[model samples]
Target: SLYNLLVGTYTEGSSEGIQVYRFDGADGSVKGPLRVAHTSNPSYLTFAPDQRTLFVVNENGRGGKGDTVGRATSYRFDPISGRLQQISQVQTLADHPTYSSLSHDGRYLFVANYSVQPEGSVAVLPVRADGSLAPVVQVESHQASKVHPRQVSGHVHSVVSSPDGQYLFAPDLGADKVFVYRYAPEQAERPLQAADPAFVPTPPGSGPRHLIFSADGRFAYLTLELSGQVMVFAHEGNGRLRQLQTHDLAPAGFQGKVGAGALHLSADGRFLGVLNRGDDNQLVTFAVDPASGQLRFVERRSVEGTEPREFAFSPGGRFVLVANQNSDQLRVFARDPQSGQVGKTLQSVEVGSPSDLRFVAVP
Candidate 1:
């Protein structure tokens, strides 16, 4: 099988915009990256349900002055040619719009604007019939609750929807909580509303960054940036989450600047993987208990590069591709499907300040 791999990067460096590549899932090889789209700081990317529409956030400053606002751009993608053409753009609520997710039905796009002093917020944009974004329908700011110095204000990092698309969950790193909202896709004007028991709180100073739903939709996994912890939550199926457990990313007694960056669960739901960025540059794997959704730490191995910002499974779940930001390289590893362990590096591609890698299958 073949898939198109899209790499999002910080354009401040050698990266111009999104880097496109043709990936061979069968042999773990990459053909292109042959093309790069020039755009300002397209740091994160997501695709619409139809897979033809690609969305990226232009993580640059606005207001014609200081660091004020950020923008999100929409593009039409051709899976066959690995081409990206801009269609529309919209300004986000605040600065540093880091992550975004589209509703399951592709009716709405939710973005998390990372901010501090002015308070970070979540923007809900309506997806028009032509795949362009209508004006932001709702912009909701987070509360300042946690007491860490980094928690001076709210920093909404990632926003994702439930499996059924009935709710939206935003992990606010500065606020140390996962905010929940009810999603009403049928509504055009006001599509997001506060869910009862609005948020699930984490430990003080724990920066909740990314949240992922389990394969079965029975649980949720959260990655805490500052505290270097992976939290497990039982999905209530509505709009609420029950805290299940929290496990440290670092080995017991290991110290010195551990920051968790990304969290992902295996496609088969047998394993959970996390990337730790700060002091420890490694990917940790854990076995997931099917009965209780609990985690059993399996392996901790070096990610082969620094600052492993994000990684993704191959189309058939055969290989793992990691984007290392600081080192500016993309490494592909052999993944053992049975034991869920990552093997030696199969290939390494030099990329410019890569952040996220997403795969789109070519039929």
Candidate 2:
């Protein structure tokens, strides 16, 4: 069996734009780092429900100015030819839009803008039937907070949806909070409204980067970029999240730079994985309690590269692919499901400053 793995990259280096690779589902081998599209700093990409459309967030400014905002491009994806046909492009609300996600019904796309000077914001774009994007319907700016030096401005890092698609959660790295919004796709004018609670505050200097829900949607895990910790929260169905526990990413008594990148849960809800992007550059695994939704430390394995920006688990749960941005390579590692640990490297595919990884099944 084979799968299509689409990698988004930073074009400031050697990367062209989006790289398409054929992934072997049977043994976790990767092939063909083909450039399928050309855009400026396409750092993040997300696919539509049917896998016929792809959306990318270009992280750089268009006017070559520090204050100029970036763009979001839409493309029609061909599974057979591995080609991306440009559909439309729209300017984002702010500079350096980092992450985006499609609505549950595939009607809208939400983007998080990570900016330094301007206050961070979230943009909502309507998705056309032909996979094109309408101009941003709404751009919501976050309030600035002064917890850390980096928190002088609002920096929205990632936007994700609830399992039932009733709410949208946007984590702001610079504000030290996760803003919640009630999503209403039926409304054409404004599809998002602030939730009753508005936002959930993390540790003052935590610097929340990425968030992932459990398989069952009862729990949410957040990785703190500055504190190097995984924060566990209990979902209350509404827009509220209760803090359950926080676990440090570094091993006990270890001293070095502390940086956390991504957090993910296995398909079966048995294991949780996160990437540490400091000098260690390691992947840590934790066993999840089925009943309590708590995590138990399992093992930490070297990613075999530096600055693992993001990682994804294979559909079959047998392999974990890490995108090492500084190393310019994607390393595949075998997984031990029973023990919730990752073993030695299986394969490594070379690419340029890979940042995001998305997979689609080929018919």
Candidate 3:
């Protein structure tokens, strides 16, 4: 019932960057979040296969001269001690590195840049033996932008590898498409290559922000940040995705506009949860149709916090914690594994500019 709750945050306000908290699943109580690692803006973090190393995206910079490029940093994390030790940091060619994921084999790290002012790119960096990041080996940039006024340039929001470790999917918000790349870990110099189909185009300005695959690797799911919608895709081999379904975040009579935040599946793979960021400020759940890999409408609950950027399930999926960015709060909810429902807010705590939540099993 013990877990380490890792929070990545923007240092702009009262936050000190990456903080670690103690989570008790039995009673839904949270303890101290000691400032574990100090960095500028460790907005997103991913774990290596070993679960002891952390890859963080320093989401800073805007094409300046000094310390102006986005960076990727590696850290030695001790889940038992709740501490983070800086290992190595490397800068990327683009600005605003927002998200990152490690290769299935834990040999390479995939990072995405969400440069709003200029352009965006995807970078591949090698993870060294000591858990440090080597210089970026390959950088891929897109040449297209979408129809939204905010889509001034191609912005790659998140880059994630497929469950099987064969393909890397990058969801570009500005480009309004998800680019699929074949991961060739054998080629250490450059491990990512454009897949056969290259990319899957979404609606004109849907702004694909994040994606996650089913554990069985039979299906894929995506969140459209701009249009406030969730989509399902059939996972076709050779890095091809067949669009299956799309669902809106808001109901019929719901007033005001909607914009989606992040998407994740329950640990059991029976429920898919997404946070509607803008006017809705709620977490919506959908039942997974295992046979078809489709999503069925389930339930929605108000998050009671602003800018719910990310949410995570506890070690056993009985609890969920949300990082509400603008509201500077972390809200915990009790979840039902049998019914795949989450509504009751069990606890709420102050967290300055919280952006991401990751739960690590305390071994």
lDDT of 1 by residue, 176-240 (tens): 88999888866767788889889988988989999999877899999999889899989988888
lDDT of 2 at 311: 94
Between candidates 1 and 3, name the one with more favorable TM-score: 3
Better of 1 and 3 by lDDT: 3
Global lDDT scores for all candidate models: 0.86, 0.88, 0.88
Error of 2 at 187 (Å): 3.3
What digit string (tens of lDDT, one per residue) describes model 3 on residues 83-157? 899999999788889899988887888999888777789999998888889999999988656498878788898
TM-score, one value per model: 0.95, 0.96, 0.97
Using TM-score as the measure, what is the rank order of every candidate, best first? 3, 2, 1
Which sections of candidate 1 miss by over 4 Å?
62-68
Candidate 2 per-residue C-alpha lDDT over 260-336 given as tens digits, one digit per residue, 9 for 90 to 100 = 88888888889999998787789999998888888999999899999999999998888999999999999999987
Off by over 4 Å in 2: 62-68
Which 10 consecutive positions of candidate 1 have the poorest summed lDDT? Answer: 60-69
